[PDB]
Amino acid sequence: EKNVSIVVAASVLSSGIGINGQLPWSISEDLKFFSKITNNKCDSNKKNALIMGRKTWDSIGRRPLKNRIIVVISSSLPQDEADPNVVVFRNLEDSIENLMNDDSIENIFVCGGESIYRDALKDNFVDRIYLTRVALEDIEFDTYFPEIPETFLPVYMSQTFCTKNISYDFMIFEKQLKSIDDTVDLLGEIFGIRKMGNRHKFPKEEIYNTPSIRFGREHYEFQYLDLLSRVLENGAYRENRTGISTYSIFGQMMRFDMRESFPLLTTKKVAIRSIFEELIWFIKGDTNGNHLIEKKVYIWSGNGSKEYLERIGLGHREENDLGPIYGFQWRHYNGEYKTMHDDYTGVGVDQLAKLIETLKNNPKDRRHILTAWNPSALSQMALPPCHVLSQYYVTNDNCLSCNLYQRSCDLGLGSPFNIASYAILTMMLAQVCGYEPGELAIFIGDAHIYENHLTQLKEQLSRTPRPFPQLKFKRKVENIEDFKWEDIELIGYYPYPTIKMDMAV
Amino acid sequence: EKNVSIVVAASVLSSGIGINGQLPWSISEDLKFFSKITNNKCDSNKKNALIMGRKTWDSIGRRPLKNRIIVVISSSLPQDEADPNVVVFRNLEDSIENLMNDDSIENIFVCGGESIYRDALKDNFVDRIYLTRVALEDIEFDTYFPEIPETFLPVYMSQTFCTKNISYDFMIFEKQELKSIDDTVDLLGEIFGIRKMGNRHKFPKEEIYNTPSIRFGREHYEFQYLDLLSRVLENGAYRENRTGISTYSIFGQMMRFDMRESFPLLTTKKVAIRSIFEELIWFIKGDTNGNHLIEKKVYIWSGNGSKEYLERIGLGHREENDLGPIYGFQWRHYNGEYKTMHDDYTGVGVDQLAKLIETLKNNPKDRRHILTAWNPSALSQMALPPCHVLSQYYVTNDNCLSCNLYQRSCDLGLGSPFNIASYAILTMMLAQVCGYEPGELAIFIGDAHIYENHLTQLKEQLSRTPRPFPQLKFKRKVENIEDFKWEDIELIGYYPYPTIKMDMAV
Numbered sequence A: 001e002k003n004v005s006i007v008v009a010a011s012v013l014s015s016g017i018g019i020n021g022q023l024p025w026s027i028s029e030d031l032k033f034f035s036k037i038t039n040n041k042c043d044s045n046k047k048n049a050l051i052m053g054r055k056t057w058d059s060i061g062r063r064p065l066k067n068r069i070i071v072v073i074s075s076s077l078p079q080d081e082a083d084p085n086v087v088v089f090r091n092l093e094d095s096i097e098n099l100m101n102d103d104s105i106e107n108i109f110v111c112g113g114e115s116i117y118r119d120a121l122k123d124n125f126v127d128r129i130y131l132t133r134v135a136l137e138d139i140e141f142d143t144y145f146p147e148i149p150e151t152f153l154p155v156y157m158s159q160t161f162c163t164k165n166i167s168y169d170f171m172i173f174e175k176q177l178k179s180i181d182d183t184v185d186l187l188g189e190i191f192g193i194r195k196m197g198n199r200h201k202f203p204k205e206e207i208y209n210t211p212s213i214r215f216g217r218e219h220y221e222f223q224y225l226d227l228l229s230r231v232l233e234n235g236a237y238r239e240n241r242t243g244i245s246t247y248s249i250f251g252q253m254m255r256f257d258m259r260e261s262f263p264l265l266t267t268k269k270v271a272i273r274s275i276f277e278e279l280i281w282f283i284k285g286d287t288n289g290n291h292l293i294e295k296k297v298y299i300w301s302g303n304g305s306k307e308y309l310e311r312i313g314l315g316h317r318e319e320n321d322l323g324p325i326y327g328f329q330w331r332h333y334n335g336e337y338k339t340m341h342d343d344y345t346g347v348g349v350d351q352l353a354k355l356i357e358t359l360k361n362n363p364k365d366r367r368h369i370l371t372a373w374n375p376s377a378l379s380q381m382a383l384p385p386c387h388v389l390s391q392y393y394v395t396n397d398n399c400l401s402c403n404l405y406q407r408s409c410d411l412g413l414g415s416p417f418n419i420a421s422y423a424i425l426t427m428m429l430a431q432v433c434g435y436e437p438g439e440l441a442i443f444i445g446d447a448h449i450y451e452n453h454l455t456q457l458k459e460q461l462s463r464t465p466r467p468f469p470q471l472k473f474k475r476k477v478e479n480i481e482d483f484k485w486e487d488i489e490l491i492g493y494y495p496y497p498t499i500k501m502d503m504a505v
Numbered sequence B: 001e002k003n004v005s006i007v008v009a010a011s012v013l014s015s016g017i018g019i020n021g022q023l024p025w026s027i028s029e030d031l032k033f034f035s036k037i038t039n040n041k042c043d044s045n046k047k048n049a050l051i052m053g054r055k056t057w058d059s060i061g062r063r064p065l066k067n068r069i070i071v072v073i074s075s076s077l078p079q080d081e082a083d084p085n086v087v088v089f090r091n092l093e094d095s096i097e098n099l100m101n102d103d104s105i106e107n108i109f110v111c112g113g114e115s116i117y118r119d120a121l122k123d124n125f126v127d128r129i130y131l132t133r134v135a136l137e138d139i140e141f142d143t144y145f146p147e148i149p150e151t152f153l154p155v156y157m158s159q160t161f162c163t164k165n166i167s168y169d170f171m172i173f174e175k176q177e178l179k180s181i182d183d184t185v186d187l188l189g190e191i192f193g194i195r196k197m198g199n200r201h202k203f204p205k206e207e208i209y210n211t212p213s214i215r216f217g218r219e220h221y222e223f224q225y226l227d228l229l230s231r232v233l234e235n236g237a238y239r240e241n242r243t244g245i246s247t248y249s250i251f252g253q254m255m256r257f258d259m260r261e262s263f264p265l266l267t268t269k270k271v272a273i274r275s276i277f278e279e280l281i282w283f284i285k286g287d288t289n290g291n292h293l294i295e296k297k298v299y300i301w302s303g304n305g306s307k308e309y310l311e312r313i314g315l316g317h318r319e320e321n322d323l324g325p326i327y328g329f330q331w332r333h334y335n336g337e338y339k340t341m342h343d344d345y346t347g348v349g350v351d352q353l354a355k356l357i358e359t360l361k362n363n364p365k366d367r368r369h370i371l372t373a374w375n376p377s378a379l380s381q382m383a384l385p386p387c388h389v390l391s392q393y394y395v396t397n398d399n400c401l402s403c404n405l406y407q408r409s410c411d412l413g414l415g416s417p418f419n420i421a422s423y424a425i426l427t428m429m430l431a432q433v434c435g436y437e438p439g440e441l442a443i444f445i446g447d448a449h450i451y452e453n454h455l456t457q458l459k460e461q462l463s464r465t466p467r468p469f470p471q472l473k474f475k476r477k478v479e480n481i482e483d484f485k486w487e488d489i490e491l492i493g494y495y496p497y498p499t500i501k502m503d504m505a506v
Ligand SMILES: NC(=O)C1=CN([C@@H]2O[C@H](COP(=O)(O)OP(=O)(O)OC[C@H]3O[C@@H](n4cnc5c(N)ncnc54)[C@H](OP(=O)(O)O)[C@@H]3O)[C@@H](O)[C@H]2O)C=CC1
Pocket: A007, A008, A009, A010, A016, A017, A018, A019, A020, A021, A022, A023, A052, A053, A054, A055, A056, A057, A059, A073, A074, A075, A076, A077, A090, A091, A092, A111, A112, A113, A114, A115, A116, A119, A143
């Protein structure tokens, strides 16, 4: 009685694993993972057994795998005894004799074959599942990994990795002291909200995304879903300037890798083009909302209407003249603002240009900072800056990381946009300055969920995350303002359906 | 064979537990903790046994404790059989008969007596220790808890709690003698190098981890600082900076501290709290004259305000200690045209602090309570660009004031404890002026680094197990935030480890 694990690499949506007798992809790291997971053993005087079908045995050239024993399921292959590293059985059931006798076999791996997978899961021989989720779906398959039965639950989901612009994930499925916890519970019974742990309660299972993954929430999309869960658990019900009240907490953070993937949420289709258009609108220094409306981007329409402007005391302002906001403090900080039609070339401090110059002239400098919080101009703005401050860091291996402090975070609408936007901005700065993308950390003050999003976000929490996509630039620009939407290629983005959520004005 | 736990409340330094036959303090929550930990059982048809000495039995009025069975060790008390809730034994060894027979006893607690504690530890009967550390040392004791033997290791240390301005901690000591996920993660980290982000944030090795036996119970929020030190020592890249002293640096970290039940002043090192207050009130008043700090015997800004340093950074025209428009000039006169430190700036610039107070007490649920010091127009005029760059403030529904701080650059040896204590004091001042209670303090850090001439010192600091945080109280309620004086601050129950000298990088 020992352990049996399926090892498979399947596509993310349709679970395709093969085409015309070979693999539909070439990922070296996935083969290295197969090797290390099938060689992983405890007793040096024992070997592991790798069960595979006959066509799979043909796929690997009919040659043995070093240090392991291959078990081929075939009804026609001659039961040869010459090779002690390869043995043939007439059916999968008889081949499980590695359990009964043969104490020199430590662990068993079901290594390939749609038929082998299917009748190993149907016969309930499988204890564990090592699944490599590959983000390739618009290709041809003829062999599929069967659907994982409900008796299995996921216990691990790795970060997204990238090979040849292909995103992939690693997941584990499993078939399914107290004294410290008791003392903490007693202290939390004695002290009420006086104990800070009671103010940061762990989210209940009903609001926790994929709860069976307890210790292996490595995929960095969990940094967003778990913040959603924390707000749902501990969020105080509070009113704000809009008619829609929120559930709010104060002081949170999220980390995202940008070396091996692009942090665009997969549990919901995100409008990446509107994000890019808003970001390039910021970079060019523009505050004219009509330039966004003309490009079919309407995210600033609510905060730039005649009624809203007259209500907040800017009735003199033109229709979509948002005032000195993001991109006017970026390029013309402390500049005397008049209208959106005037020429501001030369006035104010160009934070972006000085930032680029310092990033490529003094990388280890600790002052790479871009701010939008200008107390002298807050009254002239249609909306004070939400993503308030950002800092940039050049690693010793020439990667560019970004920190963002955001004073107020609409988790339903604003947060995915902010994640993708500052990811794109860090990538642009890295290309312009000759670096690679690093990490993205977002520090949040008032993180809140609007009450008219509760149905939506909870729905989003029911969807198990998929591996992040990749984002590449088609050309190397000479100035950061020259980026165009056609220059951006989004590779391997297979999200869940769109979740409509109304904005609070 | 069942579990045996000592339960004791002792002072933080000398381990005093009694005086003149009674307790040297009155902490209700600690008695409630004793009750809940001695009543905690699994079988409803069983009871717990509480072993105590005879003088201890006199201290509690010689009356039984509800739902439990008291075991009194005495050589003269009559072995009465009338009370089934109290039983007497002639020695501690015979009283351990609860193990051999009496299956109605689930757990055993050694509940008091210096002699009982001492010969229960000497006889090696004790499995666990529940210790309440009380921060009271300048009083008289006649009864002490014996030294914890080396066979015990701490596994839990709670946050600091406050009762009647007295700080205390809860700790657990234990006597000592799935893997699939870990193996898969290790294999992925072998395949991918620094390509796997986990390998860029490696868990600190035991040799640089403060009190390593506390694995799952690092609740004391001083661990938020020591663990950041450890993370920098583990993953910090060796980097040069504008000073001659290189650092080990990482990017993107955070620390949380409670301010409702304690004051986050580090205990693993004696911190100059007076200099912190003086610098903070110097900021609040709008002052940029370093001589005003030097006159009060505070020399933290001398290095960045010398004639040589000013001439070196291009401010040779500037007077000796004229630091320029820095912290407290952007607070009170933001975007104001700076001349010298002697001129009158009353009215010029934006008074961020005043508007912050007005908005905090007029619109508490507003999401724009922000104080910034990063002014790109004035960076060149500053003797040093702002480190604690931006701060935001939040009013909870229960009328508490919490603070978030983004800090672009963090000297963990010198600057970080000062920043923690300083923004704690500032949040408390704002809370008193606006009529709230102190809440939480979160610090978000960009370049968190350790200067290489601090490595020995901080390592020394990492060898010291943290003590409970002290309390900080104000003696009077001021009418304006600028009226705070050093005499107005009372620091109660601060018993730190000795000072660790560390030189500043200019
Ligand atoms: N992405 C991944 O992880 C993997 C992908 N693949 C891909 O999948 C494809 C091959 O898999 P697949 O098409 O399913 O072929 P198989 O690997 O399952 O091999 C099938 C053969 O196994 C024997 N066999 C299967 N079931 C039985 C049974 N119940 N009794 C007796 N013999 C049996 C038969 O051999 P016989 O005809 O001699 O009787 C059968 O022809 C290839 O493209 C391969 O590259 C393969 C492995 C892993």
